[PDB]
Structure 1
Amino acid sequence: XIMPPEAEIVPLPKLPMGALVPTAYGYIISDVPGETISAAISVAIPKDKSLCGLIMEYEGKCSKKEAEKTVREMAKIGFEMRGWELDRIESIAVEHTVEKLGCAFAAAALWYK
């Protein structure tokens, strides 16, 4: 997940080493050579600013585009369940092709400005 009301999506700040950062994340690890794995994160933003944003996570043995498409739909669904007016959805995705043992990771880090 949940983006607090009036929080802003900004590029990753300079975080003190060892800081305890509340983070919503999705990850997947595979030891199968040649297997493509992906992780994605989406943040649904409300039209009503007094409401909170919704953060969804996704991971699976698929492509980056499929993962991003899936995670954005999940965020959409979250807003429909709440009956809230959706402003837009921000997202990020990554895919990895396992050489021997690999991990794909996507996250939404919450911090303080």
Structure 2
Amino acid sequence: XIMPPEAEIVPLPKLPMGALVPTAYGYIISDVPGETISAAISVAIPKDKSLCGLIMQYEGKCSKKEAEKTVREMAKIGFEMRGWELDRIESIAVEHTVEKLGCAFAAAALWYK
């Protein structure tokens, strides 16, 4: 996940080493050579600025494009379930083709301005 009301989405700041960072994340690990794994994260922002944003995570054996589409849909469903008006959805995803043993990771890290 939940983005606090009035919180701003910003590029990752210079975090002090060892910080206890509240993080919503999705990840997947695979040891299957040639296998393509992906992870995605989405943040649904409400029109009503008094409300919170919803953070959804996804991971699976699919393409980057498929992962982001899925996680974005998940965020939308979250707002539909609450019945809140959506402003927009922000997201990113990553895919990895396993060589020997690989990991795909996506997250929303909460911190302080």
Partner deviation per Cα, 1:37-96 (whole Å, 9 max, x = no partner): 000000000000000000000000000000000000000000000000000000010000
Query: What secondary structure, in the 3-state scheme, does the structure 2 residue paired with 1:18 have?
Result: coil
Give the C-alpha shift of residue 34 in structure 1: 0.3
Query: What secondary structure, in the 3-state scheme, does the structure 2 residue paired with 1:100 have?
Result: coil
Percent identical across equivalent pairs? 99
TM-score normalised by the chain length of structure 1: 0.99
Give the C-alpha shift of residue 16 in structure 1: 0.3
Extract unaligned runs of 5+ from structure 2.
none
Whole-angstrom CA distance in 1 between matches of 2:92 and 2:65: 10
Q: Aligned-residue CA RMSD in angstroms?
A: 0.2
Whole-angstrom CA distance in 1 between matches of 2:11 and 2:59: 22
Extract unaligned runs of 5+ from structure 1.
none
Whole-angstrom CA distance in 2 between matches of 1:82 and 1:65: 26
Query: What secondary structure, in the 3-state scheme, does the structure 2 residue paired with 1:38 have?
Result: strand
TM-score normalised by the chain length of structure 2: 0.99
Query: What secondary structure, in the 3-state scheme, does the structure 2 residue paired with 1:84 have?
Result: coil
Give the C-alpha shift of residue 14 in structure 1: 0.6
Partner deviation per Cα, 1:8-58 (whole Å, 9 max, x = no partner): 000001100000000000000000000000000000000000000000000
